[PDB]
Design an enzyme around this catalytic site. Structure first.
Site, mmCIF file in Angstrom:
data_model
loop_
_atom_site.group_PDB
_atom_site.id
_atom_site.type_symbol
_atom_site.label_atom_id
_atom_site.label_comp_id
_atom_site.label_asym_id
_atom_site.label_seq_id
_atom_site.Cartn_x
_atom_site.Cartn_y
_atom_site.Cartn_z
ATOM 1 N N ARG A 30 -118.823 43.918 35.780
ATOM 2 C CA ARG A 30 -117.434 43.469 35.792
ATOM 3 C C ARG A 30 -117.366 41.977 36.161
ATOM 4 O O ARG A 30 -116.619 41.213 35.546
ATOM 5 C CB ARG A 30 -116.619 44.304 36.791
ATOM 6 C CG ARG A 30 -115.106 44.039 36.765
ATOM 7 C CD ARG A 30 -114.332 44.974 37.707
ATOM 8 N NE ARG A 30 -112.960 44.509 37.915
ATOM 9 C CZ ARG A 30 -112.421 44.243 39.106
ATOM 10 N NH1 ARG A 30 -113.124 44.402 40.222
ATOM 11 N NH2 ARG A 30 -111.181 43.774 39.180
ATOM 12 N N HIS A 34 -115.796 39.057 33.838
ATOM 13 C CA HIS A 34 -114.612 38.305 34.222
ATOM 14 C C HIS A 34 -114.806 36.797 34.311
ATOM 15 O O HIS A 34 -113.832 36.046 34.341
ATOM 16 C CB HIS A 34 -113.986 38.883 35.491
ATOM 17 C CG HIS A 34 -113.133 40.082 35.214
ATOM 18 N ND1 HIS A 34 -112.125 40.505 36.053
ATOM 19 C CD2 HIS A 34 -113.119 40.928 34.156
ATOM 20 C CE1 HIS A 34 -111.524 41.554 35.520
ATOM 21 N NE2 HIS A 34 -112.109 41.832 34.369
ATOM 22 N N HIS A 163 -117.336 50.752 30.402
ATOM 23 C CA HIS A 163 -116.609 51.591 31.350
ATOM 24 C C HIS A 163 -117.356 52.895 31.607
ATOM 25 O O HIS A 163 -116.905 53.745 32.371
ATOM 26 C CB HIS A 163 -115.187 51.865 30.857
ATOM 27 C CG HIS A 163 -114.248 50.729 31.110
ATOM 28 N ND1 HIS A 163 -112.983 50.665 30.569
ATOM 29 C CD2 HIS A 163 -114.388 49.620 31.872
ATOM 30 C CE1 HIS A 163 -112.381 49.566 30.988
ATOM 31 N NE2 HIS A 163 -113.213 48.916 31.780
ATOM 32 N N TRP A 195 -114.685 56.874 34.728
ATOM 33 C CA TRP A 195 -114.357 57.233 33.347
ATOM 34 C C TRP A 195 -115.311 58.339 32.899
ATOM 35 O O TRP A 195 -114.967 59.161 32.054
ATOM 36 C CB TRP A 195 -114.550 56.040 32.407
ATOM 37 C CG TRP A 195 -113.511 54.973 32.516
ATOM 38 C CD1 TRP A 195 -112.399 54.825 31.736
ATOM 39 C CD2 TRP A 195 -113.502 53.884 33.445
ATOM 40 N NE1 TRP A 195 -111.699 53.703 32.119
ATOM 41 C CE2 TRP A 195 -112.354 53.108 33.167
ATOM 42 C CE3 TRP A 195 -114.354 53.489 34.487
ATOM 43 C CZ2 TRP A 195 -112.035 51.954 33.894
ATOM 44 C CZ3 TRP A 195 -114.038 52.343 35.209
ATOM 45 C CH2 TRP A 195 -112.886 51.591 34.907
ATOM 46 N N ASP A 224 -108.015 52.208 27.055
ATOM 47 C CA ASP A 224 -109.151 53.020 26.629
ATOM 48 C C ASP A 224 -108.604 53.907 25.514
ATOM 49 O O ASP A 224 -109.204 54.027 24.443
ATOM 50 C CB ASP A 224 -109.671 53.910 27.764
ATOM 51 C CG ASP A 224 -110.173 53.117 28.959
ATOM 52 O OD1 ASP A 224 -110.981 52.184 28.764
ATOM 53 O OD2 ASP A 224 -109.770 53.445 30.098
HETATM 54 C C1 HEM Z 1 -110.591 46.049 27.085
HETATM 55 C C2 HEM Z 1 -110.025 45.219 28.231
HETATM 56 C C3 HEM Z 1 -110.363 45.800 29.615
HETATM 57 C C4 HEM Z 1 -109.440 46.297 30.531
HETATM 58 C C5 HEM Z 1 -107.908 46.378 30.384
HETATM 59 C C6 HEM Z 1 -110.237 46.732 31.674
HETATM 60 C C7 HEM Z 1 -109.713 47.289 32.840
HETATM 61 C C8 HEM Z 1 -110.435 47.710 33.930
HETATM 62 C C9 HEM Z 1 -109.853 48.269 35.133
HETATM 63 C C10 HEM Z 1 -108.368 48.494 35.435
HETATM 64 C C11 HEM Z 1 -110.877 48.562 35.967
HETATM 65 C C12 HEM Z 1 -110.730 49.159 37.369
HETATM 66 C C13 HEM Z 1 -111.210 48.123 38.426
HETATM 67 C C14 HEM Z 1 -111.026 48.575 39.875
HETATM 68 O O1 HEM Z 1 -110.517 49.670 40.142
HETATM 69 O O2 HEM Z 1 -111.422 47.818 40.753
HETATM 70 C C15 HEM Z 1 -112.113 48.187 35.257
HETATM 71 C C16 HEM Z 1 -113.398 48.347 35.755
HETATM 72 C C17 HEM Z 1 -114.591 47.980 35.120
HETATM 73 N N1 HEM Z 1 -114.639 47.374 33.886
HETATM 74 FE FE1 HEM Z 1 -113.100 46.946 32.708
HETATM 75 N N2 HEM Z 1 -111.614 46.522 31.488
HETATM 76 C C18 HEM Z 1 -111.681 45.928 30.224
HETATM 77 C C19 HEM Z 1 -112.860 45.513 29.630
HETATM 78 C C20 HEM Z 1 -114.113 45.603 30.163
HETATM 79 C C21 HEM Z 1 -115.308 45.101 29.492
HETATM 80 C C22 HEM Z 1 -115.322 44.394 28.117
HETATM 81 C C23 HEM Z 1 -116.343 45.371 30.334
HETATM 82 C C24 HEM Z 1 -117.780 44.810 30.269
HETATM 83 C C25 HEM Z 1 -118.548 44.792 28.955
HETATM 84 C C26 HEM Z 1 -115.763 46.053 31.496
HETATM 85 C C27 HEM Z 1 -116.494 46.521 32.574
HETATM 86 C C28 HEM Z 1 -115.977 47.150 33.681
HETATM 87 C C29 HEM Z 1 -116.797 47.665 34.774
HETATM 88 C C30 HEM Z 1 -118.330 47.621 34.881
HETATM 89 C C31 HEM Z 1 -115.901 48.189 35.664
HETATM 90 C C32 HEM Z 1 -116.183 48.875 36.994
HETATM 91 C C33 HEM Z 1 -116.355 48.019 38.217
HETATM 92 C C34 HEM Z 1 -116.576 48.847 39.465
HETATM 93 O O3 HEM Z 1 -116.893 50.063 39.350
HETATM 94 O O4 HEM Z 1 -116.443 48.306 40.572
HETATM 95 N N3 HEM Z 1 -114.390 46.167 31.390
HETATM 96 N N4 HEM Z 1 -111.832 47.650 34.028
#
Ligand code: HEM
Ligand code: NA
Ligand code: NA
Length: 275
Positions: A30, A34, A163, A195, A224
């Site tokens: 993440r 970002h 995710h 997820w 998603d």
């Molecule tokens: C399509 C647009 C995206 C949206 C709207 C989105 C949204 C989110 C949200 C709401 C979370 C929850 C974070 C939390 O609770 O702290 C999350 C977690 C995460 N996202 Fe996304 N995401 C997107 C794209 C991506 C992409 C492109 C990747 C990397 C290739 C990614 C990787 C992750 C990871 C690894 C987590 C988990 C972090 C953790 O467990 O602490 N996301 N994302």
């Protein structure tokens, strides 16, 4: 004494030890995304164009809503960063992410390094370039954000597959349940909602789960869900749900592309660690 390439390799070793000890693979992916995700293909100049330039290390950017909780990842990497003056935060963020995917069982990402770091928080991009999980029109919102980065539909779907790693916390982004049977015992800090059942395993389950929606403890954000509702996204989403090899191929390529967005390399073409 130690070349910059050698330092990156040592840093990778430290990261692998960190991942084995803290189980923080998800947050590293993440963090990397970002930093890179603020890229705007329409802006020509570095660092105004945003992207992988290490600006995410500054408080001003960490405070953006989309970056809630990321300071933890920065803090986890700081000790490693301090060991290598030849390693930039820009490279370190991407190295931690790629290593995380791979250590989690994901594909080998064709990575290159040599990214230059911005030097002042004044160089951080303004807030608002990262996506929202709950906009009024999810699919269109994804296009607005990713097309700006120069990424296509295939890349939007493949990258969303990350995710398969991690979870959401209502105390961070605001999405998800406080805990579930899959997260109540960690490893790492327990809590949040994942997820996938095995949220520390990198595979194509994300695509199967968001489509099946048979497990109430599994998270599905509007963005998603858009992957299977959208006439174009669904083509790739179904493909990845049925073809894990296809997903790994497209993912590795998309991840590498994302990791380079907006960066300025030194030398210009960057360098490889294992090429
Ligand atoms: C399509 C647009 C995206 C949206 C709207 C989105 C949204 C989110 C949200 C709401 C979370 C929850 C974070 C939390 O609770 O702290 C999350 C977690 C995460 N996202 Fe996304 N995401 C997107 C794209 C991506 C992409 C492109 C990747 C990397 C290739 C990614 C990787 C992750 C990871 C690894 C987590 C988990 C972090 C953790 O467990 O602490 N996301 N994302
Ligand atoms: Na940046
Ligand atoms: Na998983």
């Amino acid at each position: 004494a130690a070349s910059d390439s050698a330092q990156l390799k040592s840093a990778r070793e430290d990261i692998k030890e960190l991942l084995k000890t803290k189980f923080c693979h998800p947050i590293m992916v993440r963090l990397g995304w970002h930093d890179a995700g603020t890229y705007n293909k329409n802006i020509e100049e570095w660092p105004q164009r945003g992207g992988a330039n290490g600006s995410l290390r500054f408080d001003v950017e960490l405070k953006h809503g989309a970056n809630a909780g990321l300071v933890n990842a920065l803090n986890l990497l700081k000790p490693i960063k301090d060991k290598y003056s030849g390693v930039t935060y820009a490279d370190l963020f991407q190295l931690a992410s790629a290593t995380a995917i791979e250590e989690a069982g994901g594909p080998k990402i064709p990575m290159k390094y040599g990214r230059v770091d911005v030097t002042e928080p004044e160089q951080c991009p303004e807030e608002g370039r990262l996506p929202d999980a709950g906009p009024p029109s999810p699919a269109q919102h994804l296009r607005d954000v990713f097309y700006r980065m120069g990424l296509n539909d295939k890349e939007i779907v493949a990258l969303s597959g990350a995710h398969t790693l991690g979870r959401s916390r209502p105390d961070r982004s605001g999405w998800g349940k406080p805990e579930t049977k899959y997260t109540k015992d960690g490893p790492g800090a327990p809590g949040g909602q994942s997820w996938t059942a095995q949220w520390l395993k990198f595979d194509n389950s994300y695509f199967k789960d968001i489509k099946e929606r048979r497990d109430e403890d599994l998270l599905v954000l509007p963005t998603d869900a858009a992957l299977f509702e959208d006439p174009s996204f669904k083509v790739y989403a179904e493909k990845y749900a049925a073809d894990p090899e296809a997903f790994f191929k497209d993912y590795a390529e998309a991840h590498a592309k994302l990791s380079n967005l907006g960066a300025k390399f030194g030398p210009a073409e960057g360098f490889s660690l294992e090429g």
